[PDB]
Amino acid sequence: TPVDKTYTVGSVEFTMKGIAAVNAQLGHNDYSINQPHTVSLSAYLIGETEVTQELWQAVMGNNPSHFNGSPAVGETQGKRPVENVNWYQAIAFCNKLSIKLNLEPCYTVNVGGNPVDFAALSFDQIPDSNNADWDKAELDINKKGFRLPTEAEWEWAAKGGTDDKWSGTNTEAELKNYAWYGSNSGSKTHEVKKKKPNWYGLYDIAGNVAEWCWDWRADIHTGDSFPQDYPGPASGSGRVLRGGSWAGSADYCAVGERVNISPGVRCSDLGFRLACRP
C-alpha cells in the first residue's frame, strides 16, 4: 500500500490516501448497467476528502460554489466541498495543482491545434458548455500529477475493502453516520470529514457532493472484461460522477450506482476528489 501523503498549497493542507494494487471486483448483479466485473488496478492514491472550497480557491483564485455561505451550525465554510464546477474546470484545477506542487500534469488539451498552457490559462478560458477540444483531453496516467480517478479506481476505493452497498454500511438506517444525503443534509453541503470514514480512511465517499470521474459512460454488461487500469471508452456523451450527494436518495449514494452528465454541466451537488500515483 502506497504511503499516505499530505500536501500544502499556501496554508491549505490535503491528504492523499494509498490504495494497494488489486484485481478490483466491481459492480453488482443488481445494477443492470454496472454488472459484476474485474479491473486490475495499479497502486494509486485517492483524496482523503473531496476538494474543499479553500483548496479550490488556493489554486484557482475564485469560488464558484453554490453553497459559498451559511454553513450548518459548527461547520467551517472553507472546508465544505467545492461544487458548481464542470468536468473541464475540474481537470484544469488538477493540472494547476500539479504545476503549483512541481509535479508533471496528467492532462493535455489542444485548442485549435495549440497546446493549452495550464499555468497561463485563466478561468474564463475554460469552457462552460460542451467543447470538442476539451472533450479530447488526453490522460497520461503515468505522470505523477493530480487527476480525476478512473471510475474503477473510484469504485474500488469507495468499497473500502468490503461488499456493503454503501461506503461503511449495508443499511440505509446506518447511512446517516457515514453520509450527508437527502434525508439528513438539510438541503446543503457540509464540512468534509464530519461523518465516519470507510476502512481505507476516505470521508464522504457517500453523500455530500457527487464526484467527477475521468471516464466516459458506457454500460457494463454481464461477463464484460476490461484491460489493466481501464480508463473507460474512447468516446461517450456523458462523463461519470459517483457517490451521491446532499440532494440524493440513499440509493443514489450506493458505491455501485453509476451516474453521468455532459461535461459542460455543473451543479450545487457535484464536486470532485483527487487521484494520483506514487
Annotated binding site, which residues?
Answer: 50, 204, 207, 209, 211
What residues numbered 14-53 form the site for Ca ion, per CB under 5 A?
A: none
Asked if residue 150 binds Ca ion (CB under 5 A), the reply is no
CB atoms near residue 29 (< 10 Å): 9
**Residue whose CB is less far from Na ion, 25 or 184:** 25
x/- map, 203-242, Ca ion, by CB under 5 A = -x---x----------------------------------
Which of Na ion, Ca ion, none lies near 208, with the C-beta cut-off 5 to 8 A by kind? Ca ion
Instruction: Please give the annotated binding residues for Ca(2+), written as ranges.
Output: 50, 204, 207, 209, 211
| Closest distance to Na ion from the beta carbon of 35 (Å) | 11
Question: Which residue's C-beta sits nearest to Na ion?
Answer: 256
Angstrom distances, CA of residue 93 to CA of 82, 86, 171: 11, 11, 35
Q: How far is CA 245 from the centre of its chain?
A: 12
Select from 149, 232, 244, 256 the one that contacts Na ion (CB under 5 A): 256
Q: Strands, DSSP E only, in the chain?
A: 5-9, 12-19, 22-26, 37-41, 44-47, 107-108, 110-111, 114-115, 138-139, 210-216, 239-242, 259-261, 270-271, 275-276
How many residues line the site for Ca ion (CB under 5 A)?
3
| Closest distance to Na ion from the beta carbon of 159 (Å) | 7
> Per residue in 243-258, is it b (16+ CB within 10 Å) or e — as a string?
bbbbbbebebbbbbbb
What residues numbered 191-210 form the site for Ca ion, per CB under 5 A?
A: 204, 208
| Closest distance to Ca ion from the beta carbon of 61 (Å) | 24
Which of Ca ion, Na ion, none lies near 144, with the C-beta cut-off 5 to 8 A by kind? none
Q: Which of 109, 110, 81, 123 is nearest to 241 (CA)?
A: 81
Q: Cell 490522460, residue?
A: 139
Helix 87-100 × helix 53-60 angle, to 10°: 70
Which of Ca ion, Na ion, none lies near 243, with the C-beta cut-off 5 to 8 A by kind? Ca ion
Which of Na ion, Ca ion, none lies near 85, with the C-beta cut-off 5 to 8 A by kind? none
| Closest distance to Ca ion from the beta carbon of 216 (Å) | 21
Q: What are phi and psi of 255, to 5 degrees?
A: -60, -25
Asked if residue 28 binds Na ion (CB under 5 A), the reply is yes
CB atoms near residue 70 (< 10 Å): 7
| Closest distance to Ca ion from the beta carbon of 204 (Å) | 4
**3: which DSSP letter?**
P
Residue type for position 188: K
**Residue whose CB is less far from Na ion, 82 or 240:** 240
Residue type for position 189: T
Select from 127, 243, 256, 263 the one that contacts Ca ion (CB under 5 A): 243
**Sites of contact with Ca ion (CB under 5 A):** 204, 208, 243
Question: Could you list the residues that contact Na ion (CB under 5 A)?
Answer: 28, 255-256
